[PDB]
Amino acid sequence: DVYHDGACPEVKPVDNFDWSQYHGKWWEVAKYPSPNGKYGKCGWAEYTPEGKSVKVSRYDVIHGKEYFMEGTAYPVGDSKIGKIYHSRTVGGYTRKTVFNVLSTDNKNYIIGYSCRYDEDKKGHWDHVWVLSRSMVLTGEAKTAVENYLIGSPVVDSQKLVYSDFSEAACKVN
Numbered sequence: 001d002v003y004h005d006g007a008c009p010e011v012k013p014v015d016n017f018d019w020s021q022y023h024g025k026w027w028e029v030a031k032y033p034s035p036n037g038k039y040g041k042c043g044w045a046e047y048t049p050e051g052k053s054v055k056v057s058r059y060d061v062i063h064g065k066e067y068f069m070e071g072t073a074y075p076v077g078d079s080k081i082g083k084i085y086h087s088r089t090v091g092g093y094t095r096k097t098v099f100n101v102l103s104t105d106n107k108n109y110i111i112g113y114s115c116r117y118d119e120d121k122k123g124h125w126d127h128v129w130v131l132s133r134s135m136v137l138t139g140e141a142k143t144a145v146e147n148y149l150i151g152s153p154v155v156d157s158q159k160l161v162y163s164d165f166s167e168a169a170c171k172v173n
């Protein structure tokens with residue numbers, strides 16, 4: 001997540017999201033950076049049914065160590081509109097965050113986005129992520145993704161960090 005002044009932007013989620021396709025493993029090929037240098041060029045997400053929700057298990061190798069973050073996702077309203085809640089509870093503290101699917105073809109890629117207000121300054125914290133069923137995007141999908149990131153007024157495509165899944169980035173020790 002990245003800081004910017006002002007209110008979160010207006011965003012239009014996709015309206016033909018297919019919730020059935022929200023399963024298995026997806027590689028995180030691009031994302032914004034995070035503060036305190038805490039990121040990452042080797043990461044992925046796995047999705048599993050948990051009642052009406054999906055359990056979102058995210059794995060990352062950052063500076064030689066494994067990090068794990070789990071949470072539950074479920075639609076805010078109609079499952080076709082990609083406006084969704086992520087929920088994570090640790091001890092007595094739950095955080096619930098609306099995120100948006102900004103672009104998808106429901107099978108090779110998902111581009112997601114979330115925004116939160118800085119309770120301090122008049123500003124906000126943004127995050128963009130790009131998931132892909134293949135480690136490397138190619139073809140139509142790569143075209144659809146580059147077009148979207150380039151056309152989109154919401155995404156700052158120069159702040160994106162790209163993952164290589166290289167031997168060096170993915171090594172734990």
Ligand SMILES: O=C(O)c1ccccc1-c1c2ccc(=O)cc-2oc2cc(O)ccc12
Binds near residue numbers: 071097
């Ligand atoms: O997984 C999280 O930590 C998270 C928390 C709040 C909002 C979004 C996410 C979340 C992601 C956060 C960072 C990131 O690099 C990738 C994320 O991917 C998600 C994918 C989901 O389907 C559903 C949720 C996420």
